[PDB]
RNA sequence: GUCCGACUUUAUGUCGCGCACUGGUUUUCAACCGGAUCUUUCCUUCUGGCUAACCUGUACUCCUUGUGGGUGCAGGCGAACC
């Protein structure tokens, strides 16, 4: 069953994961009976420094918030299966250009659909199960900008290790070097 | 501390928290939370008050941070926004009432006083409104069409 | 505008020069004759199926456009036929760096083929001189409505 | 300073004050400059060796002056634990 | 003073300050359960409740308006959440 | 009520840099004092400085290190020709050495150097030497 | 490369500012403006042109075997231009 659950299937690595996410459909009276109405948009992969990868699964986000209701049991049943591999739950955005002046009209971009929202949502769904309570940017001496992220020190611990993986994809994702806090 | 008509510079106020989306120990229903909203409106209590008593009595910090958007606009949506905003209906209210009182005692001076300021900021608000086309252009409020919208 | 019946004064309105004959098998309306101005403007379709006759139109009638082309805001609609438009712009004085509101009002001829409503914005355009006053035609109301294209609000 | 040739033509480069970096005028008659001695392994002050510093007439004048230097007592290592970057 | 870390007051110096003027802009008050003394169901009310809060399950009012929170019933139990 | 936010920011510069004081926080942090710190910092005039979300308007805290000597907003921002940035460099900044008068630009916010070399001018916003 | 001076009636070498004019600049370099580009990132975009251009690939290689370069026309490269 794994056909038609990708809305198209190449890059067979997507395929074991949909295998994955067959096996782990098996288990019925708990990760099932929703779990099948749950699409994906191409889930890609990431290198990740010190030996690991990240797979980024994207969800269409018509009902994102069922992948964030499941997303915890989800997760763990993959990377359980996937050894030295880290799992993302990523929502997929589509980013508008911006309305300049020469363009011709393309009906007001809304604000939800421009690159500041889209990577705060990225932001927000790179970490889920733990909140993000404050946002922070600095500038180094030389110019460059790297962003903080308070997290909550409470919950933390649905992470413990994964600190590097978030670090990583988002890095492949935008460029912007990022480092997370942990608060007393 | 602008307080226009009046030098105080107090800042009273309410700073709403940094967590735009729900807080984790909630319970209840974006949905029913809808429809409890829509119900106390045709009860008839005006958006404030229905913030308040959803905040007071249930979980409900911010409607627009539970059903994702704001009690006035669910109201528009559902088709129970008041002919009138509240916040002007409320000025009308307060005008109607100290041209009352004035009328029944004439003497008083800080009461015409008041009454010039409250005009004022019924002007001044009306006039914000008609800009933004919520009331109909020619709409206006001196003595007697103000009495009117007063019942 | 000439509103309802054009033909309403003591003389004939007929389209100078143009001659539609009775003797012809075809009862057809009329020879309805008109023109593109130029410039990249699109003649209204009102100015080809409209019943009007102005020959001060700058669509249907004699006048022709060239020159200078403006943009303003209708200001004044109460005269027949014809605008007032104003023009807000700003003036440098230099003696302090800065800047001056200023307004022009300019009348302007309107062919019964455009609507126009007090605060719409206008492009005109300089033609052969009609009045006193008048120098312009109205080529294109940009903002027909504007803010006012809703009317009601009905979830 | 530096003319063509590249020569210095400014006469005595005049320092900084330590706590903020604000210059020291030449009649500024309230900066002063401590000499801090040197410790070796056995709690003898090492002679002629110290570690200077310069604090302007401007922070004596708040008052802050003692503060800042705890911030120098710290950040050189001269001093344990007196001063919090975080207050 | 003349050198701090406005990134990182001290907790205890933070919550000293006045809201709305912290580094973010927090609300000072909280979210409690209350029980009152006869239903055992649970109640969430707004610490400032400005309302006389009322039980819906019967007629116990738990909270009376006050300039700061609601003052408690006397026989009701609250928990922080 | 609060008009040239850019002009508070500086004004709280310039006050907390007399003083003597490292850190400043500057509270309406809009787009074009994040611009100018950039500027500034690239010249060297402060050290490592701080944004803060705040899910309304932000914040800004910047480190000081004394470098500085006095910055300025020229707050009814004149339009200046290419040729007229000659007269604004006199009359404001202390000695052609140094100096930068600070402008928006087609291409952006940048200093009168930036500007010629550039060949465009714009808008000026401010004075920092 | 060209060669300027101590060097003086005049030439070579030596030694001089470390080049008085012509030159590569992936030896790094640094700027200092650019331009095209890929990033869920359009530059009015079409409607035909004209195809300027080869993804064409067709008859096939003219060339040491090697796409260095060619006689060459149906889909189809459009800013190189109308
Ligand atoms: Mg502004
Ligand atoms: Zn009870």
Redesign the interface.
């Given at each position: 069953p794994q056909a038609k659950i990708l809305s198209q299937a190449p890059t067979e690595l997507e395929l074991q994961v949909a295998q994955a996410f067959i096996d782990l459909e098996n288990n019925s009276p708990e990760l099932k009976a929703d779990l099948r109405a749950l699409q994906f948009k191409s889930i890609r992969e990431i290198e990740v420094a010190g030996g690991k990868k990240a797979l980024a699964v994207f969800v269409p986000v018509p009902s994102l918030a069922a992948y964030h209701k499941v997303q915890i049991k989800l997760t763990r049943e993959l990377e359980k299966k996937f050894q030295d591999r880290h799992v993302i739950f990523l929502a997929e955005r589509r980013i508008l250009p911006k309305p300049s002046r020469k363009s011709r009209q393309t009906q007001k971009r809304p604000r939800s659909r421009t690159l500041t929202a889209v990577h705060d949502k990225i932001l927000e769904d790179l970490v889920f199960p733990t909140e993000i309570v404050g946002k922070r940017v600095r500038y180094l001496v030389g110019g460059n900008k790297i962003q903080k992220i308070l997290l909550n020190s409470k919950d933390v611990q649905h992470i413990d290790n994964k600190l590097e993986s978030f670090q990583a994809v988002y890095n492949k994702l935008t460029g912007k070097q990022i480092v997370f806090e942990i608060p007393s | 501390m602008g307080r226009m008509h009046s030098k105080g510079k107090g800042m009273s106020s309410s700073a709403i928290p940094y967590s735009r989306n729900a807080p984790a120990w909630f319970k209840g229903s974006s949905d029913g939370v809808v429809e409890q909203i829509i119900k106390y409106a045709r009860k008839g209590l005006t958006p404030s008050q229905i913030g308040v008593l959803l905040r007071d009595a249930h979980g409900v910090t911010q409607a627009k941070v539970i059903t994702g958007n704001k009690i006035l606009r669910i109201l528009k949506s559902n088709g129970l926004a008041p002919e009138i905003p509240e916040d002007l209906y409320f000025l009308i209210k307060k005008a109607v009432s100290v041209r009352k009182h004035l009328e029944r005692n004439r003497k008083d001076k800080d009461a015409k006083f008041r009454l010039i300021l409250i005009e004022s900021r019924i002007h001044r608000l009306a006039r914000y409104y008609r800009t933004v086309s919520v009331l109909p252009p020619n709409w206006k409020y001196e003595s007697a069409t103000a009495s009117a919208l007063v019942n | 505008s000439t509103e309802l019946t054009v033909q309403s004064e003591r003389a004939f309105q007929k389209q100078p020069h143009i001659f539609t004959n009775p003797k012809a098998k075809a009862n057809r309306k009329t020879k309805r004759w008109y023109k593109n101005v130029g410039l990249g403007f699109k003649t209204p379709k009102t100015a080809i199926e409209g019943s009007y006759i102005d020959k001060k139109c700058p669509f249907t009638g004699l006048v022709s456009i060239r020159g200078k082309i403006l943009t303003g805001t209708v200001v004044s609609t109460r005269m027949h036929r014809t605008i007032v438009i104003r023009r807000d712009y700003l003036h440098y004085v230099p003696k302090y760096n800065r800047y001056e509101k200023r307004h022009k009002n300019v009348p302007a001829h309107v062919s019964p083929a455009f609507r126009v409503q007090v605060g719409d914005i206008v492009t005109v355009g300089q033609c052969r001189p009609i009045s006193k006053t008048v120098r312009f035609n109205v080529l294109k109301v940009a903002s027909a409505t504007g803010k006012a294209n809703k009317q009601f609000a009905k979830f | 300073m530096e003319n063509d040739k590249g020569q210095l033509v400014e006469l005595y480069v005049p320092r900084?004050?330590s706590?903020?970096?604000?210059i020291i005028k030449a009649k500024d008659h309230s900066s002063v400059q401590i000499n801090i001695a040197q410790v070796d392994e056995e709690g003898r002050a090492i002679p002629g060796e110290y570690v200077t510093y310069a604090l302007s007439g401007?922070?004596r004048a708040?008052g802050?002056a003692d503060?800042?230097l705890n911030?120098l007592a710290q950040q050189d290592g001269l001093l344990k634990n007196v001063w919090s970057?975080?207050? | 003073?003349?050198?701090?870390?406005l990134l990182?007051?001290?907790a205890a110096?933070e919550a000293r300050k006045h809201k709305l003027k912290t580094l973010v802009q927090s609300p000072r008050s909280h979210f409690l359960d209350v029980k009152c003394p006869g239903c055992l169901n649970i109640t969430t009310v707004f610490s400032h409740a400005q309302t006389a809060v009322t039980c819906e399950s019967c007629s116990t009012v738990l909270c009376t308006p006050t300039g700061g929170k609601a003052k408690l019933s006397e026989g009701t139990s609250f928990r922080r959440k | 009520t609060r008009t040239s936010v850019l002009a508070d920011a500086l004004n709280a510069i310039n006050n907390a840099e007399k003083?003597?004081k490292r850190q400043v926080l500057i509270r309406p942090s809009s787009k074009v004092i994040i611009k100018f710190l950039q500027v500034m910092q690239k010249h060297g005039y402060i050290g490592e400085f701080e944004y803060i979300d705040d899910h309304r308007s932000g914040k800004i805290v910047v480190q000081l290190?004394?470098?500085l000597n006095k910055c300025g907003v020229i707050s009814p921002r004149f339009n200046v020709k290419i040729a007229d940035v000659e007269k604004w460099t006199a009359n404001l900044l202390p000695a052609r050495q140094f100096g930068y008068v600070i402008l928006t630009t087609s291409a952006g916010i940048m200093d009168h150097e930036e500007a010629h070399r550039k060949h465009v001018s714009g808008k000026i916003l401010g004075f920092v030497y």
């Open positions: - | - | - | 900084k004050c706590a903020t970096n604000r401007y922070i708040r802050e503060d800042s911030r970057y975080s207050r | 003073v003349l050198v701090q870390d990182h007051p001290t110096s | 003083t003597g290190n004394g470098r």
